[PDB]
Amino acid sequence: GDELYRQSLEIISRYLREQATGAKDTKPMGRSGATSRKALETLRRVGDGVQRNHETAFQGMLRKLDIKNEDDVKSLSRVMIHVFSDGVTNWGRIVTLISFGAFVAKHLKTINQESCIEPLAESITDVLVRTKRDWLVKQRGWDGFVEFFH
Ligand SMILES: Cc1cc(OCCCc2c(C(=O)O)sc3ccccc23)cc(C)c1Cl
Numbered sequence: 001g002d003e004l005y006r007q008s009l010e011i012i013s014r015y016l017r018e019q020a021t022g023a024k025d026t027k028p029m030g031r032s033g034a035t036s037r038k039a040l041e042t043l044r045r046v047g048d049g050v051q052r053n054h055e056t057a058f059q060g061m062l063r064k065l066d067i068k069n070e071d072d073v074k075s076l077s078r079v080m081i082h083v084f085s086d087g088v089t090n091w092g093r094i095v096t097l098i099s100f101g102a103f104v105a106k107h108l109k110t111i112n113q114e115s116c117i118e119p120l121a122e123s124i125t126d127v128l129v130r131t132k133r134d135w136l137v138k139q140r141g142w143d144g145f146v147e148f149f150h
Contacts, residue, residue: 004141005129007032011039011142012098012128013121015047019102020109020117039142042149043098050092050099058103067104073116073123080127089135091148097124 001008014025029036051058067073084097101124105117129136139145 001129001133003032004133004136005125007036007039007142008129009122009125011036011043012101012125013118014040015043015098016102016105016117016121016124018044019047020105020114035142035146038146042146043095046095046149047099047102050095051103054096054099058100061100062104062107065104067107067116068111069113070116070119073108073120076120077123077127080124081131084127085131089132091139091145094128094132094145097128 010029010031017023017025065072065076065079067076080097084093087093101120105120108114108116108120139148
């Protein structure tokens with residue numbers, strides 16, 4: 001996974017954390033950090049409407065999952081894979097995956113389970129990169145993500 005994986009995890013966990021708490025890391029990267037910031041800016045921008053517009057499907061999804069603990073979060077992978085894989089793959093679908101992650105993360109802070117946010121982000125990244133690796137590489141990874149939403 002390397003650089004695409006490292007970059008994806010950094011963006012998605014920071015995004016899920018900011019959405020739940022606070023917030024800001026104000027922390028280094030400091031890697032391919034120009035790309036990461038821009039992607040974090042666009043995701044913050046694009047993620048905006050998406051959460052609101054799907055407040056209904058999201059709420060429906062959330063009740064249906066009944067997430068209460070760390071063991072619950074660790075079993076979401078295949079349901080994630082089931083809703084996300086088969087179809088058109090495009091950046092809107094990817095932002096919906098991550099936006100729902102943020103939605104779940106906020107719920108996690110609500111039931112006082114902020115500690116599950118990080119394994120949640122890790123799980124989402126693992127699903128994003130394993131099911132969409134070749135599409136992602138083809139789109140210039142996160143650099144391309146910004147252009148589609150400029
Ligand atoms: C079960 C789950 C699914 C996730 O995203 C699936 C892909 C995005 C998506 C859809 C899609 O790809 O069209 S429809 C839909 C409805 C509710 C929530 C998300 C969603 C994302 C997470 C974090 C979890 Cl836990």
